[PDB]
Amino acid sequence: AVPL
Amino acid sequence: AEELVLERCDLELETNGRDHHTADLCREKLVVRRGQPFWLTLHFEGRNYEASVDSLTFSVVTGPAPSQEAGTKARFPLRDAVEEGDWTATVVDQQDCTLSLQLTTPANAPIGLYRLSLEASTGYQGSSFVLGHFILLFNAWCPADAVYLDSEEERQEYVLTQQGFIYQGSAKFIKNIPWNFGQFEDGILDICLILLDVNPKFLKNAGRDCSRRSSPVYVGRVVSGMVNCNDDQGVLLGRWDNNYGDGVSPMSWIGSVDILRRWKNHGCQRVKYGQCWVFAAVACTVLRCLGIPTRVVTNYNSAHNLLIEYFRNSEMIWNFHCWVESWMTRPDLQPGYEGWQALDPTPGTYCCGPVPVRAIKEGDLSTKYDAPFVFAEVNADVVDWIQKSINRSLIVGLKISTKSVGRDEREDITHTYKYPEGSSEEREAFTRANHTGMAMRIRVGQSMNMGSDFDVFAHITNNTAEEYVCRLLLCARTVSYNGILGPECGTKYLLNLNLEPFSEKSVPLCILYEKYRDCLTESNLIKVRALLVEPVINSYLLAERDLYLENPEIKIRILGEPKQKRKLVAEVSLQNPLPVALEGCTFTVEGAGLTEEQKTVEIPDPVEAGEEVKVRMDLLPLHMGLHKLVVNFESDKLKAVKGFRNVIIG
């Protein structure tokens, strides 16, 4: 997961 | 009458496992499900049980501090009358020297390891044996059990199936990864029991925790807290910085077994490393193992702004997020909340849920437990103000996904969390959820002169009775004419901004010449952007505003009579707006009808900051009526500044  | 001699107790591992759907778990220890009869056979030395003379009483205990009041200890006679819903034992077969019994447990009994004992009294003299141990699990096949599932295919999927899929990637590129839950592998059940046995509630009050394991709501809640580390007893250590060299990469894992084993094998110490899907996967494993019907779900978010920056660089928003749902009644809540319950083991308590998926769809956020957290995962609220207008640069809650019952296909369950956009049901939910409103605009209320320092304001209005605690990011960048944002020239960030009911605030940011002077563009333009965040309900307010830094005004004074063709003198001046000095200053003045030649006057000495500068030009009007004098002012740091002056003649 990566910050949106 | 000789006293009965118990030779051995057969646990009927084979027939029991098969019947209880625990065959794989019946290694050499008996494992069964609650509220359902199970079997065992006593082999006697010498004479067999004679009901007329023998009295057999059973004793069961679970946990470090059993008691009957708390339901972790039970005593029950071997007899023919069978009271449904209780602990009982009755005879079902009696051969030469064998006595086959059937035992049943309440459907709401505490799950866990039990020690089974037998008291055999023949008239006066008596004896005691420890028959053995069994483990007692939740029972999705039992209609009286809170985790009852009425579809056999779904019990196979959500309880018995040891592999599945976990969805990742993005809404546009849904990627599946295979996963070995392995809930029935050697050692796994024991590890799950340990996990309960080390949870903070067991430390605080062992006897009470063991008793509360009758509830899948309680067990679920405890599992959701124990999957992440936090207090070093937890299972997994999260990490998202892309640096996993001293551990295992979150993307590398293909199952839960190795993680659970590693954790136990190191004395219940965190395993490195995990991410959301890995926390969810392990939880699913533990819950299935204990017999609570569970599935891993993935939600997608997307974006196209100040929002992005705010997130780049304690809840936040990812491309996707995973958690679990578990199946059970909710007798602790208003009627009608039985069903799928969301639990989020990804890092008020370290636990999160269970909350009814249904209460989330309805916006019923007071329903225990932790409704707002889950609601915020599938709902965002983004609005702009340009001067109010809904912004769609951010979209939360898309393509919610979980594996299909008994097929390698993906099921879309978005409908279970969210009514359709625009639907009237959706509007009722937002209404139940967040009880005109709140707004934000950039104010300046002043002239902004090239050269000066000045404040801009995030002006925030709260016209509701609700109190809001917000984060506010307010910042400025130079903005060229083609609209491209140059370097930043002022930032303010409040982690805690309080807005009382029906109040307002003007939040200042100082803009300084020193910071903007050199990062300016051909435009003299600075863009102010503000973002107001309210994290509970997940609401965002965006306010943007471009500002024009004006050049000083050129003062032009006419001196003399305006009569047709009389002489006149023009006084032209400018006050240096810079806090530094102007060099190579020159005015240029012209105007057909007033002067016939172009006057250019050089300024010998540097014009000091804040200081005025005057020159004069003789003019010769020639015709009656309006004539404009026009002026340019030039310098090393302040260029092409203009002014004009109307003059009327008589």
Tokens of B418: 């969210």
Nearest residue, CB atoms, A2 vs list B302, B319, B394 = B319
Distance, in Å, from the CA atom of B11 to the CA atom of B17, rounded to the nearest integer, reads 10
Task: Tell me how far apart the terminal alpha carbons of chain B are, to the nearest angstrom.
Answer: 147
B318 → chain A, closest CA residue = A3
Final residue belonging to a domain, choices B95, B113, B140: B140
In this structure, are B464 and B526 located in the same domain?
A: yes
Shortest Cα distance, chain B CAs vs residue A1, angstroms: 6
The answer to whether residue B344 is catalytic is yes
| Complete edge-to-edge strand list for the sheet that includes strand B294-303 | B355-356, B339-343, B320-328, B294-303, B394-403, B410-412
Tokens of B382: 């983004």
Asked whether residue B444 is marked as a ligand-binding residue, the answer is yes
Task: Tell me how far apart the terminal alpha carbons of chain A are, to the nearest angstrom.
Answer: 9
Residues 1-4 of A with CB under 8 A from B: 1-4
Tokens of B524: 């003299």
Tell me if residue B392 falls in helix, strand or coil: coil
Distance, in Å, from the CA atom of B256 to the CA atom of B283, rounded to the nearest integer, reads 9
HSE-up of B496 (CA within 13 Å, CB side)?
0
Select which of B321, B352, B489, B627 is catalytic: B321
The enclosing domain of B269 has a CATH number of 3.90.260.10
Shortest Cα distance, chain B CAs vs residue A4, angstroms: 5
Distance, in Å, from the CA atom of B8 to the CA atom of B14, rounded to the nearest integer, reads 17
Look at residues B338, B333, B236 and name the one whose alpha carbon lies nearest to residue B280: B236
CB B333 within 8 A of CB B356: yes
C-alpha separations of B256 from B262, B324, B342 in Å: 10, 14, 20
Instruction: Report the b/e string of B522-549 with b at 16+ CB within 10 A.
Output: ebbbbbbbbbbebeebbbbbbbbbebeb
- Amino acid, single-letter form, for residue B93: D
In this structure, are B146 and B135 located in the same domain?
A: no
- State CA B589 to chain mean position distance: 65
Q: Angle, nearest 10°, between helix axes B188-197 and B276-290?
A: 100
Instruction: List, in sequence order, every beta strand (DSSP E) within B241-376.
Output: 271-274, 294-303, 320-328, 339-343, 355-356
In this structure, are B191 and B130 located in the same domain?
A: no
A4–B303: do the CB atoms touch at under 8 Å?
A: yes
Nearest residue, CB atoms, A3 vs list B275, B318, B394 = B318
Q: What are the start-end ranges of the H helices in B271-423?
A: 276-290, 306-312, 357-362, 371-378, 414-417
In this structure, are B159 and B232 located in the same domain?
A: yes
In this structure, are B576 and B531 located in the same domain?
A: no
Chain A contact set for B276 (CB, 8 A): 1
Question: For residue B46, how many other CB atoms are within 10 A of its CB?
Answer: 10
The answer for residues whose C-beta is within 8 angstroms of residue B132's C-beta and 6 or more apart is: B9, B11, B30, B115, B116
The answer to whether residue B475 is catalytic is no
In this structure, are B189 and B82 located in the same domain?
A: no
Final residue belonging to a domain, choices B140, B173, B204: B140
Final residue belonging to a domain, choices B78, B113, B140: B140
Question: For residue B15, how many other CB atoms are within 10 A of its CB?
Answer: 16
In this structure, are B124 and B153 located in the same domain?
A: no
3-class SS string, B566-598: CCEEEEEEEECCCCCCECCCEEEEECCCCCCCC
CB B506 within 8 A of CB B443: yes
What is the total count of domains within chain B?
4
Nearest residue, CB atoms, A1 vs list B302, B303, B318 = B318
Distance, in Å, from the CA atom of B233 to the CA atom of B582, rounded to the nearest integer, reads 68
In this structure, are B276 and B403 located in the same domain?
A: yes
The answer to whether residue B455 is catalytic is no
In this structure, are B429 and B526 located in the same domain?
A: no
The enclosing domain of B587 has a CATH number of 2.60.40.10
In this structure, are B420 and B520 located in the same domain?
A: no
Chain B contact set for A3 (CB, 8 A): 311-312, 316-318
Full domain range(s) for residue B211: 141-304+314-379+393-436
HSE-up of B52 (CA within 13 Å, CB side)?
1
In this structure, are B581 and B513 located in the same domain?
A: no
C-alpha separations of B544 from B436, B441, B522, B527 in Å: 21, 7, 20, 7
Shortest Cα distance, chain A CAs vs residue B317, angstroms: 6
Distance, in Å, from the CA atom of B463 to the CA atom of B60, rounded to the nearest integer, reads 62
In this structure, are B412 and B451 located in the same domain?
A: no
B320–A2: do the CB atoms touch at under 8 Å?
A: no
Distance, in Å, from the CA atom of B429 to the CA atom of B443, rounded to the nearest integer, reads 34
Q: Which helix (H) or strand (E) holds B225?
A: helix B216-226
